[PDB]
């Protein structure tokens, strides 16, 4: 049940949306791999954890692309 605490504490987490919690999962779980290793499970989690943590970044990049263009769009259009 500690065991079961955990994974579902780490459910939420990436429930969340909130990339710092992702980010705890997957620090969390990258470090139980290295030191007890995975269940075929919590493999499944990590890559989870991994991919909802790529996909933010990629989207904060997009963000910030975007932003920029608008920005460098009108000061060209002000000259």
Same mark, same amino acid.
């Given at each position: 049940?500690?065991?079961?605490?955990?994974?579902? #504490?780490?459910?939420?987490? !990436?429930?969340?949306? *909130?990339?710092?919690?992702?980010?705890?999962?997957?620090? *969390?779980?990258?470090?139980? *791999?290295?030191?007890?290793?995975?269940? #075929?499970?919590?493999?499944?989690?990590? #890559?989870?954890?991994?991919?909802?943590?790529?996909?933010? !970044?990629? !989207?904060?990049?997009?963000?910030?692309?975007?932003?920029?263009?608008?920005?460098? *769009?009108?000061?060209? #259009?002000?000259?």
């Amino acid at each position: 049940t500690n065991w079961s605490r955990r994974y579902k #504490a780490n459910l939420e987490k !990436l429930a969340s949306g *909130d990339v710092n919690k992702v980010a705890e999962v997957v620090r *969390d779980l990258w470090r139980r *791999d290295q030191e007890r290793g995975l269940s #075929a499970g919590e493999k499944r989690m990590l #890559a989870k954890a991994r991919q909802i943590l790529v996909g933010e !970044l990629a !989207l904060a990049e997009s963000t910030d692309d975007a932003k920029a263009e608008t920005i460098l *769009d009108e000061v060209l #259009a002000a000259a």
